[PDB]
Amino acid sequence: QDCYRGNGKNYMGNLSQTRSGLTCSMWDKNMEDLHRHIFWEKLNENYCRNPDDDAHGPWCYTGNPLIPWDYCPISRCVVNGIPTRTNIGWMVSLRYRNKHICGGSLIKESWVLTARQCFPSRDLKDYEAWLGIHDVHGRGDEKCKQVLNVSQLVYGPEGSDLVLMKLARPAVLDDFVSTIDLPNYGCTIPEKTSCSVYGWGYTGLINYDGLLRVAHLYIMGNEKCSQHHRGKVTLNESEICAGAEKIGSGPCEGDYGGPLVCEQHKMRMVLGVIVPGRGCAIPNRPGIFVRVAYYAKWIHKIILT
Amino acid sequence: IKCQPWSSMIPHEHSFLPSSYRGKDLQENYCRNPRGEEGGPWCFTSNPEVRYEVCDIPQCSEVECMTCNGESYRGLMDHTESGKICQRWDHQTPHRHKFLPERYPDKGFDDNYCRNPDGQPRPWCYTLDPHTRWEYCAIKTCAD
Amino acid sequence: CKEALAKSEMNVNMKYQLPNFTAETPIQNVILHEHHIFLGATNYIYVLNEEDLQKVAEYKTGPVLEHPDCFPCQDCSSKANGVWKDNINMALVVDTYYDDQLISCGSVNRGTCQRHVFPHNHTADIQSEVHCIFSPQIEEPSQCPDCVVSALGAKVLSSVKDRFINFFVGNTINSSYFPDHPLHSISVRRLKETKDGFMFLTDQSYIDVLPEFRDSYPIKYVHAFESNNFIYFLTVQRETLDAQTFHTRIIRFCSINSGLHSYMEMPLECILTKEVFNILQAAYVSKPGAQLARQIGASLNDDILFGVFAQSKPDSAEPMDRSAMCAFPIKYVNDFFNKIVNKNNVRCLQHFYGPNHEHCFNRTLLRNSSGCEARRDEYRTEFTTALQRVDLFMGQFSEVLLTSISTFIKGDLTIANLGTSEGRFMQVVVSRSGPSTPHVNFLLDSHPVSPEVIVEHTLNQNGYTLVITGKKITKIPLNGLGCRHFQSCSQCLSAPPFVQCGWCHDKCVRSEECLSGTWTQQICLPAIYKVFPNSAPLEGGTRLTICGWDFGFRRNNKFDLKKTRVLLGNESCTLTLSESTMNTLKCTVFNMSIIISNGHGTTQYSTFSYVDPVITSISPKYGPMAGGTLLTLTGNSRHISIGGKTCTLKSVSNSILECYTPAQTISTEFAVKLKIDLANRETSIFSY
């Protein structure tokens, strides 16, 4: 019932039920915890209005330790890839009933970023995370192989199509397995920037030996993609559009949740997450991904747990 | 089981009567007799399996008892033995009778409630019908 | 005379020339998409223009050589050995999320489907490119990921949830069909993102009837749709595994592609008041008009499901040609699913779980506190207190079977596009307040009207409805097919104002046709067709029947009988209200004109005579006393008698009469007295 107000201060949420379905707790203890922990800056007690005026809208607290706080629901206004000759640590191969379906990005020692679409099941016993591998079957090498179970899954905001999971145990970080940083909250990549993607998918090959495919890409404004799609897409602020020039090559089945990592100033940094849509590598057609920066701060808020 | 409100057509939809019949005073939920049906005041149940059931509401003769003298009795019956209604004792139409309530007080010469002025075994009243001169009032005897 | 004036009742049969197209085989499925209309028929696919129904192109999935080892889409035409079968199209959908393309599904070909790609410059060119949807299930060859369509009967629904093309398919299953190839009663399929096959997202994403009940407990789906983040199914099935009696059921679950999570089934029934109707035949999702929304308690924007229910032959699904139509607000039934029913009305699902199984010995329900959250031990819940709805036409169609329904809105009213099994199409304004006569009641074709119809409503003033009768597809504009068929002024004024025409002194005519200027739709002159009789005595009070129409003052629907009066000269005939109708009157009162006065106008009729009865001569004169002779009278509701015994009327006329005199034991003469409703002047004597 809220519109034109992205900040909770304009909308006093007259509701005390979070997204998950768990009732809100007393706002006094969580207010004390915020004043002790959050330095953002006397709101209504035990109601889902957020004091922080977060960009995602109103949010509330939950007494359960696994999820300290969550938002209350209300209205608010690779094909033609190149094989890699060196191992990659940012890649996280997800394993569903002991076989790979998708990939993700390593952010912390116990945290990876993936796509909501790559989760047919919500069960945690069947998922398995592999870090530090050059071959999708694991045949290439096993010294850098790192196998872990799943502890917790936390989804992004509504309609974000993004998700994080924290591992059953921590993971060791070395040269073989690497983490990635975060872009700034208002971090905007300049147009015509060149950066690539990593993929484990169909790759448009009659037979592939099983090595990860790196594929270059170029950034362009949303207007160029709108013209190329000829009005078939209504782009929102949260999405970024990057497409190859004069060649049809893009992420497809099996690469979803993969990293769109690009180099701005000194080192490579993640900018987007691979998302299904619009078809599989149409010639002279750009690709659409979800930008982490708009949700990066939110990940910060959830990385505190 | 609580009656289904006559404004809401769930779980039963025969509730257009608030607009169908004017002046019949079917309230928000209280059960009436919009058609004057012989069974009595019946209402829809919020219970799904049974649609409508007649409310058990007592008759009027149940509370009005009778003594042999009759003149001592002063109750609420204003209906004769044949179901006719006693005319206003204050009125002079359609019967130009003799008893005047202010001339003869102390005997319950109220609006239409049956009285025994002439020492009959039962109370009687002049009939609202101009043709019927007067009629007796049917009352069961008292106890204890 | 009710019979004689029957011309007032509207002429039920006409020939209407509308754009109509014929197919060489009966049409099963049809869709309108981007100024092209695609029709699927036996072995045929046609594409037509809207305004012309011109066959611009056709694709030929004709007869196919069915061979036991031939795979669905591989070419086994060289096999000369194993029958030239023919397929029928029951699944014809269009999708544009991936590309602007069509999807069709055959019957005999293992229920496997194909895809047609539309060129951007010329989208109607469907024969240009053809794909098959068949991915060899290497990992799990035991089950079919692409054997998706059944043959006896199936329903397919397309959706785009989470940027994912989902097909919700319900299948009618025979016991002998599973052993050759497994199927699923209700299931969800995903298209492979390369558009070359299907996969099962979960083993829980499907439900199939338990192996013992494949032969028994048959289920036939009549409809299905999507609304409010839920997928609703409408089918017909037995009350109980051993009931041998049928009723309508609906199925609810939300649109999570992982699997059917909150699968809950619900019996439905619509009643007359108290006769119930079991089987649903056709259904349509729409929005209610302003006049109807209040009377059904529904919001103007809230969705409504309209369904036709016909009483089936006892302990069987075949209707007894006794049907009606009923409405269901989606919010009421949704709340009913969530709150209205208590606990013990809920049981486990029989045909899947099995009557004796562990889950429904004891299991709590998070039905109120939780909305179709994808849990692991989800409970497929069976209700027992069937939702009862009331009739909307109070059984005005109680003897005719209805099989096709469409509904649109116009201004504040809403109109239902009724269809019969004898191929008569009606247009009716639906209203619980009062019975509405179908403003269009013509017959289209001999064949029953197909349930699947489509309505398009451009700019709220120009639109059409395509309906299928056998091998004919016909376009019907909703803006008013006509009103020339109306010939009663009361009937003309009962026509809804959406079509602009009115009465001008002879027939219901369009405004600009009759030039007299009498064209009126609010008031008109009442009509009298004849009167019986016109010969009455001066003092004779004779009962006169008045034949005509529009005999009373008008209200919106209830035709007032009290604003009627009769004037005979200066006095008034004794009007009888109990025999006063819109159809005929019965009154009980020298040529004078009889005048009928109404709230609208008065009619003068110039031929009624107070004829003075005259009797002149009696024959014979003298004879024996046998009392069995023919006595003839002559002169100018009559009776005649002698000696207290009526002479039987051997001949009657205005100028001639003849009795067979009763026998009397006397040989003298008496005056024979005429009693023409009154003892009139008697004639002379005749010796006995």
Short mmCIF file of N, CA, C and O in Angstrom, two decimals, chain C residues 543-579:
data_model
loop_
_atom_site.label_atom_id
_atom_site.label_comp_id
_atom_site.label_asym_id
_atom_site.label_seq_id
_atom_site.Cartn_x
_atom_site.Cartn_y
_atom_site.Cartn_z
N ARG C 543 -69.26 -13.32 -21.42
CA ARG C 543 -67.81 -13.27 -21.22
C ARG C 543 -67.12 -13.07 -22.56
O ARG C 543 -67.26 -13.89 -23.47
N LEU C 544 -66.37 -11.98 -22.68
CA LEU C 544 -65.64 -11.64 -23.90
C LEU C 544 -64.15 -11.84 -23.66
O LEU C 544 -63.58 -11.29 -22.71
N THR C 545 -63.53 -12.63 -24.53
CA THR C 545 -62.09 -12.75 -24.60
C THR C 545 -61.53 -11.68 -25.53
O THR C 545 -62.09 -11.41 -26.59
N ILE C 546 -60.41 -11.08 -25.12
CA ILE C 546 -59.73 -10.04 -25.87
C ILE C 546 -58.33 -10.56 -26.19
O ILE C 546 -57.54 -10.81 -25.28
N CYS C 547 -58.04 -10.72 -27.48
CA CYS C 547 -56.73 -11.16 -27.94
C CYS C 547 -55.92 -9.97 -28.43
O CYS C 547 -56.41 -9.18 -29.23
N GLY C 548 -54.68 -9.87 -27.96
CA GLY C 548 -53.74 -8.85 -28.38
C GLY C 548 -52.45 -8.94 -27.59
O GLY C 548 -52.01 -10.04 -27.25
N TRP C 549 -51.83 -7.80 -27.28
CA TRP C 549 -50.62 -7.78 -26.46
C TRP C 549 -50.43 -6.37 -25.92
O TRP C 549 -51.22 -5.46 -26.20
N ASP C 550 -49.37 -6.20 -25.12
CA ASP C 550 -49.07 -4.93 -24.45
C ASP C 550 -50.26 -4.44 -23.63
O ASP C 550 -50.57 -3.25 -23.61
N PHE C 551 -50.94 -5.37 -22.95
CA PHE C 551 -52.21 -5.10 -22.31
C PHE C 551 -52.11 -4.31 -21.01
O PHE C 551 -53.15 -3.92 -20.46
N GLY C 552 -50.91 -4.06 -20.49
CA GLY C 552 -50.75 -3.36 -19.23
C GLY C 552 -49.69 -2.28 -19.26
O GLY C 552 -48.89 -2.19 -20.19
N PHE C 553 -49.69 -1.46 -18.22
CA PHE C 553 -48.65 -0.46 -18.03
C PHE C 553 -47.31 -1.14 -17.78
O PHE C 553 -47.23 -2.25 -17.25
N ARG C 554 -46.24 -0.46 -18.17
CA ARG C 554 -44.90 -1.04 -18.18
C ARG C 554 -44.09 -0.60 -16.97
O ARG C 554 -44.10 0.58 -16.60
N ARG C 555 -43.39 -1.55 -16.37
CA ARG C 555 -42.26 -1.28 -15.49
C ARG C 555 -41.04 -1.86 -16.19
O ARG C 555 -41.17 -2.37 -17.31
N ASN C 556 -39.87 -1.77 -15.56
CA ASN C 556 -38.65 -2.26 -16.18
C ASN C 556 -38.79 -3.71 -16.62
O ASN C 556 -38.50 -4.04 -17.77
N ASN C 557 -39.21 -4.59 -15.71
CA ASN C 557 -39.50 -5.98 -16.05
C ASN C 557 -40.94 -6.36 -15.71
O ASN C 557 -41.63 -6.95 -16.55
N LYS C 558 -41.40 -6.05 -14.51
CA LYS C 558 -42.71 -6.51 -14.05
C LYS C 558 -43.82 -5.74 -14.76
O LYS C 558 -44.02 -4.55 -14.50
N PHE C 559 -44.53 -6.42 -15.65
CA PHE C 559 -45.59 -5.80 -16.45
C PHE C 559 -46.82 -5.64 -15.57
O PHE C 559 -47.40 -6.62 -15.11
N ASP C 560 -47.22 -4.38 -15.35
CA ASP C 560 -48.28 -4.06 -14.40
C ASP C 560 -49.64 -4.42 -15.00
O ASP C 560 -49.97 -4.01 -16.12
N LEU C 561 -50.42 -5.19 -14.26
CA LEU C 561 -51.76 -5.61 -14.66
C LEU C 561 -52.87 -4.71 -14.13
O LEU C 561 -54.02 -4.87 -14.53
N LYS C 562 -52.55 -3.78 -13.23
CA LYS C 562 -53.58 -3.00 -12.55
C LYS C 562 -53.95 -1.72 -13.28
O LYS C 562 -55.07 -1.22 -13.11
N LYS C 563 -53.05 -1.16 -14.10
CA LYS C 563 -53.36 0.04 -14.87
C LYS C 563 -54.00 -0.33 -16.21
O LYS C 563 -53.57 0.06 -17.29
N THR C 564 -55.07 -1.12 -16.11
CA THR C 564 -55.86 -1.53 -17.27
C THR C 564 -57.33 -1.24 -16.98
O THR C 564 -57.80 -1.48 -15.87
N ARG C 565 -58.04 -0.74 -17.98
CA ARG C 565 -59.46 -0.48 -17.83
C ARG C 565 -60.14 -0.64 -19.18
O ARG C 565 -59.50 -0.54 -20.23
N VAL C 566 -61.45 -0.88 -19.14
CA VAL C 566 -62.24 -1.15 -20.33
C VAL C 566 -63.45 -0.21 -20.33
O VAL C 566 -64.09 -0.01 -19.29
N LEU C 567 -63.74 0.37 -21.49
CA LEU C 567 -64.84 1.30 -21.66
C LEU C 567 -65.69 0.84 -22.84
O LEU C 567 -65.20 0.75 -23.97
N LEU C 568 -66.96 0.56 -22.58
CA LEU C 568 -67.91 0.14 -23.61
C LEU C 568 -68.96 1.24 -23.74
O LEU C 568 -69.89 1.31 -22.93
N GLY C 569 -68.81 2.08 -24.75
CA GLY C 569 -69.64 3.26 -24.87
C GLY C 569 -69.30 4.26 -23.78
O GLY C 569 -68.25 4.90 -23.83
N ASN C 570 -70.19 4.40 -22.80
CA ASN C 570 -69.92 5.22 -21.62
C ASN C 570 -69.74 4.40 -20.35
O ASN C 570 -69.06 4.86 -19.43
N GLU C 571 -70.34 3.22 -20.27
CA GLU C 571 -70.18 2.36 -19.11
C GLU C 571 -68.89 1.55 -19.21
O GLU C 571 -68.22 1.52 -20.25
N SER C 572 -68.55 0.88 -18.11
CA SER C 572 -67.33 0.08 -18.02
C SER C 572 -67.69 -1.39 -17.84
O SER C 572 -68.48 -1.74 -16.96
N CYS C 573 -67.12 -2.24 -18.69
CA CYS C 573 -67.28 -3.68 -18.54
C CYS C 573 -66.54 -4.15 -17.28
O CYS C 573 -65.55 -3.56 -16.86
N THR C 574 -67.05 -5.23 -16.68
CA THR C 574 -66.49 -5.73 -15.43
C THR C 574 -65.17 -6.43 -15.72
O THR C 574 -65.16 -7.61 -16.10
N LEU C 575 -64.07 -5.72 -15.53
CA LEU C 575 -62.74 -6.25 -15.79
C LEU C 575 -62.38 -7.29 -14.74
O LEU C 575 -62.55 -7.05 -13.54
N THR C 576 -61.89 -8.44 -15.18
CA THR C 576 -61.48 -9.52 -14.30
C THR C 576 -59.96 -9.61 -14.28
O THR C 576 -59.34 -10.01 -15.27
N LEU C 577 -59.37 -9.23 -13.14
CA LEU C 577 -57.92 -9.18 -13.04
C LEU C 577 -57.32 -10.59 -13.03
O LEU C 577 -56.25 -10.82 -13.60
N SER C 578 -58.00 -11.54 -12.38
CA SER C 578 -57.49 -12.90 -12.31
C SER C 578 -57.37 -13.54 -13.69
O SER C 578 -56.59 -14.49 -13.86
N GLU C 579 -58.12 -13.05 -14.67
CA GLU C 579 -58.00 -13.49 -16.06
C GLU C 579 -57.49 -12.38 -16.97
O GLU C 579 -57.70 -12.42 -18.18
#
